[PDB]
Design an enzyme around this catalytic site. Structure first.
Site, PDB file in Angstrom:
ATOM      1  N   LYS A 124      19.953  -0.869   5.373  1.00 37.20           N
ATOM      2  CA  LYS A 124      20.005  -1.272   3.970  1.00 37.20           C
ATOM      3  C   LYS A 124      21.336  -2.001   3.656  1.00 37.20           C
ATOM      4  O   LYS A 124      21.359  -2.928   2.866  1.00 37.20           O
ATOM      5  CB  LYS A 124      19.769  -0.074   3.038  1.00 37.20           C
ATOM      6  CG  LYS A 124      18.343   0.482   3.051  1.00 37.20           C
ATOM      7  CD  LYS A 124      17.356  -0.631   2.709  1.00 37.20           C
ATOM      8  CE  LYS A 124      16.009  -0.108   2.285  1.00 37.20           C
ATOM      9  NZ  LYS A 124      15.061  -1.200   1.910  1.00 37.20           N
ATOM     10  N   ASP A 128       1.971  -8.076   9.941  1.00 42.03           N
ATOM     11  CA  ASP A 128       3.155  -7.343  10.367  1.00 42.03           C
ATOM     12  C   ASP A 128       4.342  -8.176   9.913  1.00 42.03           C
ATOM     13  O   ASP A 128       4.403  -9.396  10.141  1.00 42.03           O
ATOM     14  CB  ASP A 128       3.176  -7.146  11.879  1.00 42.03           C
ATOM     15  CG  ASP A 128       4.274  -6.229  12.338  1.00 42.03           C
ATOM     16  OD1 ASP A 128       5.474  -6.288  11.873  1.00 42.03           O
ATOM     17  OD2 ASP A 128       3.966  -5.445  13.241  1.00 42.03           O
ATOM     18  N   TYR A 160      18.817   4.300   8.753  1.00 39.17           N
ATOM     19  CA  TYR A 160      18.171   3.625   7.631  1.00 39.17           C
ATOM     20  C   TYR A 160      19.209   3.045   6.652  1.00 39.17           C
ATOM     21  O   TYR A 160      19.113   1.880   6.221  1.00 39.17           O
ATOM     22  CB  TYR A 160      17.261   4.625   6.949  1.00 39.17           C
ATOM     23  CG  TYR A 160      16.688   4.212   5.621  1.00 39.17           C
ATOM     24  CD1 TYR A 160      15.611   3.339   5.539  1.00 39.17           C
ATOM     25  CD2 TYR A 160      17.198   4.739   4.439  1.00 39.17           C
ATOM     26  CE1 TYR A 160      15.061   2.991   4.310  1.00 39.17           C
ATOM     27  CE2 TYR A 160      16.662   4.412   3.205  1.00 39.17           C
ATOM     28  CZ  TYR A 160      15.596   3.552   3.125  1.00 39.17           C
ATOM     29  OH  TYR A 160      15.024   3.280   1.881  1.00 39.17           O
ATOM     30  N   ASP A 196       0.060  -5.780   3.692  1.00 35.72           N
ATOM     31  CA  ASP A 196       0.593  -4.620   4.418  1.00 35.72           C
ATOM     32  C   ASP A 196       0.026  -4.743   5.828  1.00 35.72           C
ATOM     33  O   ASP A 196      -0.631  -5.758   6.154  1.00 35.72           O
ATOM     34  CB  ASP A 196       0.135  -3.313   3.717  1.00 35.72           C
ATOM     35  CG  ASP A 196       1.120  -2.119   3.929  1.00 35.72           C
ATOM     36  OD1 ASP A 196       1.319  -1.691   5.106  1.00 35.72           O
ATOM     37  OD2 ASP A 196       1.650  -1.583   2.899  1.00 35.72           O
ATOM     38  N   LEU A 255       0.808  -1.216   0.000  1.00 33.41           N
ATOM     39  CA  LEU A 255       0.000   0.000   0.000  1.00 33.41           C
ATOM     40  C   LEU A 255       0.847   1.275   0.000  1.00 33.41           C
ATOM     41  O   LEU A 255       0.312   2.358   0.096  1.00 33.41           O
ATOM     42  CB  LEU A 255      -0.870   0.043   1.261  1.00 33.41           C
ATOM     43  CG  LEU A 255      -1.759  -1.180   1.400  1.00 33.41           C
ATOM     44  CD1 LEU A 255      -2.638  -1.034   2.623  1.00 33.41           C
ATOM     45  CD2 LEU A 255      -2.587  -1.401   0.133  1.00 33.41           C
TER      46      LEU A 255
HETATM   47  N1  LIG Z   1      12.078   6.875  -3.008  1.00 34.37           N
HETATM   48  C1  LIG Z   1      11.636   5.692  -2.670  1.00 34.37           C
HETATM   49  O1  LIG Z   1      10.416   5.500  -2.611  1.00 34.37           O
HETATM   50  C2  LIG Z   1      12.656   4.619  -2.364  1.00 34.37           C
HETATM   51  C3  LIG Z   1      14.019   4.861  -2.575  1.00 34.37           C
HETATM   52  C4  LIG Z   1      14.924   3.871  -2.269  1.00 34.37           C
HETATM   53  C5  LIG Z   1      14.494   2.671  -1.729  1.00 34.37           C
HETATM   54  N2  LIG Z   1      13.192   2.477  -1.499  1.00 34.37           N
HETATM   55  C6  LIG Z   1      12.794   1.169  -0.951  1.00 34.37           C
HETATM   56  O2  LIG Z   1      11.656   0.622  -1.626  1.00 34.37           O
HETATM   57  C7  LIG Z   1      10.807  -0.053  -0.678  1.00 34.37           C
HETATM   58  C8  LIG Z   1       9.404   0.564  -0.638  1.00 34.37           C
HETATM   59  O3  LIG Z   1       9.505   1.952  -0.365  1.00 34.37           O
HETATM   60  P1  LIG Z   1       8.250   2.897  -0.418  1.00 34.37           P
HETATM   61  O4  LIG Z   1       8.862   4.247  -0.769  1.00 34.37           O
HETATM   62  O5  LIG Z   1       7.126   2.284  -1.259  1.00 34.37           O
HETATM   63  O6  LIG Z   1       7.881   2.980   1.119  1.00 34.37           O
HETATM   64  P2  LIG Z   1       6.463   3.263   1.824  1.00 34.37           P
HETATM   65  O7  LIG Z   1       6.851   3.636   3.218  1.00 34.37           O
HETATM   66  O8  LIG Z   1       5.649   4.122   0.923  1.00 34.37           O
HETATM   67  O9  LIG Z   1       5.797   1.811   1.879  1.00 34.37           O
HETATM   68  C9  LIG Z   1       6.301   0.816   2.742  1.00 34.37           C
HETATM   69  C10 LIG Z   1       5.107   0.054   3.297  1.00 34.37           C
HETATM   70  O10 LIG Z   1       5.616  -0.832   4.310  1.00 34.37           O
HETATM   71  C11 LIG Z   1       4.596  -0.901   5.318  1.00 34.37           C
HETATM   72  N3  LIG Z   1       5.105  -1.283   6.633  1.00 34.37           N
HETATM   73  C12 LIG Z   1       5.729  -0.474   7.530  1.00 34.37           C
HETATM   74  N4  LIG Z   1       6.025  -1.176   8.643  1.00 34.37           N
HETATM   75  C13 LIG Z   1       5.541  -2.440   8.453  1.00 34.37           C
HETATM   76  C14 LIG Z   1       5.487  -3.677   9.239  1.00 34.37           C
HETATM   77  N5  LIG Z   1       6.022  -3.740  10.494  1.00 34.37           N
HETATM   78  N6  LIG Z   1       4.909  -4.745   8.654  1.00 34.37           N
HETATM   79  C15 LIG Z   1       4.371  -4.716   7.430  1.00 34.37           C
HETATM   80  N7  LIG Z   1       4.355  -3.633   6.651  1.00 34.37           N
HETATM   81  C16 LIG Z   1       4.933  -2.487   7.133  1.00 34.37           C
HETATM   82  C17 LIG Z   1       3.927   0.466   5.382  1.00 34.37           C
HETATM   83  O11 LIG Z   1       2.575   0.317   5.853  1.00 34.37           O
HETATM   84  C18 LIG Z   1       4.021   0.940   3.950  1.00 34.37           C
HETATM   85  O12 LIG Z   1       2.758   0.750   3.239  1.00 34.37           O
HETATM   86  C19 LIG Z   1      11.505   0.028   0.653  1.00 34.37           C
HETATM   87  O13 LIG Z   1      12.361  -1.101   0.860  1.00 34.37           O
HETATM   88  C20 LIG Z   1      12.380   1.256   0.514  1.00 34.37           C
HETATM   89  O14 LIG Z   1      13.470   1.242   1.417  1.00 34.37           O
HETATM   90  C21 LIG Z   1      12.291   3.421  -1.810  1.00 34.37           C
END
Ligand SMILES: NC(=O)c1ccc[n+]([C@@H]2O[C@H](COP(=O)([O-])OP(=O)(O)OC[C@H]3O[C@@H](n4cnc5c(N)ncnc54)[C@H](O)[C@@H]3O)[C@@H](O)[C@H]2O)c1
Length: 308
Positions: free
Chosen positions: A140, A47, A136, A32, A8
């Site tokens: 990673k 979770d 963070y 999620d 989500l």
């Molecule tokens: N700019 C970016 O969006 C970007 C850049 C680099 C890396 N990433 C990586 O891509 C991935 C997704 O990023 P995103 O930007 O879509 O993040 P986001 O925070 O929009 O989505 C992450 C989701 O994980 C869920 N979440 C949080 N804690 C949780 C738990 N304990 N159990 C289950 N679900 C949980 C949240 O509800 C959220 O919907 C991540 O690994 C992030 O590190 C994203």
């Protein structure tokens, strides 16, 4: 059968639809923390730290492939370091342990946050030392290493991309540091004013979501024996400063941008300006398609529509 964790969020919002379209809706399960409504995809709440529920979802749906997007992002993680480690590291370990049990293929993304100020800031190479200065980023790096251990020691086909900052209009992000770029678009169209939380010179690698989604699908489709890297491909499209984005947007809509840095400045300052992704280009044919002006067109057109 494919499961998407973190379904989500910013990436998952678009990735679920892309996968449904490529493979069939009969093949995709979303997951999620909290159940949404008006949601087309099959959904299972979980979770990521709850190994019993996670495992149940995988075996009951016969999951063979997991796109693991669950995480806490850079800025939220800096303010809650314990939660950031727990979700990001223990969550990933849960995913990898389960992949080993059920012989799954995995996509586990990393981040440009792996890098610290000791490495080249322009065209950062694939293989430099990783000494991140954020909670963070540390998670990673540990995740890259754990993923590559599961590949080498346990034969798990796990692939990942160090995404740059991702810009989209379908879902506004809310715990990260690159978020100012999306926020600036939303606020420019909605109110013609934005308060930027980094200084006007802050310069970072950025990519439009269409490109990031396509890269993810292309990398997952590559033949395994063509890949020289697994968890952690560098990936590149754009690099620009905040005021450079302000100017691009200003060519389309009236808005005034004020710059008011907060703690997130300290995060961004430690990251590179641009990334050498030659290995992705060479190994599996990556090329980006969205430059700053094409991305800007897509963003403004769609945000204007949504604000009609
Ligand atoms: N700019 C970016 O969006 C970007 C850049 C680099 C890396 N990433 C990586 O891509 C991935 C997704 O990023 P995103 O930007 O879509 O993040 P986001 O925070 O929009 O989505 C992450 C989701 O994980 C869920 N979440 C949080 N804690 C949780 C738990 N304990 N159990 C289950 N679900 C949980 C949240 O509800 C959220 O919907 C991540 O690994 C992030 O590190 C994203």
């Amino acid at each position: 059968m494919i499961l998407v964790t973190g379904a989500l969020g910013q990436i998952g919002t678009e990735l679920v639809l892309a996968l449904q379209e490529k493979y069939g809706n009969d093949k995709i399960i979303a997951s999620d923390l909290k159940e949404p409504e008006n949601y087309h995809c099959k959904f299972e709440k979980c979770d990521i730290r709850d190994i019993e529920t996670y495992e149940r979802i995988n075996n009951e749906n016969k999951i063979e492939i997991v796109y693991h997007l669950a995480a806490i992002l850079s800025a939220a993680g800096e303010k809650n370091p314990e939660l950031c480690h727990d979700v990001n590291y223990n969550g990933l370990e849960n995913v990898l342990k389960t992949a080993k049990k059920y012989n799954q293929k995995l996509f586990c993304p990393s981040s440009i946050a792996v890098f610290g100020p000791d490495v080249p800031k322009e065209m950062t190479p694939q293989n430099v030392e990783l000494n991140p200065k954020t909670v963070y980023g540390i998670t990673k790096v540990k995740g890259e290493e754990l993923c590559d251990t599961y590949f080498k020691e346990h034969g798990i086909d796990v692939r990942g991309i160090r995404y740059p900052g991702l810009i989209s209009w379908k879902h506004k992000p809310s715990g990260g540091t690159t978020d100012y770029a999306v926020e600036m678009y939303f606020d420019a169209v909605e109110s013609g004013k934005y308060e930027c939380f980094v200084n006007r010179n802050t310069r970072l690698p950025m990519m439009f979501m269409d490109d990031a989604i396509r890269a993810t699908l292309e990398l997952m489709d590559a033949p395994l024996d063509s890949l020289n890297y697994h968890s952690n491909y560098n990936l590149s499209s754009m690099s620009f400063s905040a005021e450079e984005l302000e100017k691009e947007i200003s060519a389309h809509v009236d808005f005034n941008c004020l710059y008011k840095p907060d703690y997130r400045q300290d995060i961004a300052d430690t990251w590179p300006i641009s990334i050498n992704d030659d290995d992705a280009r060479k190994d599996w044919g990556w090329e980006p398609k969205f430059d700053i002006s094409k991305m800007t067109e897509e963003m403004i057109t769609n945000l204007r529509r949504l604000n009609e």
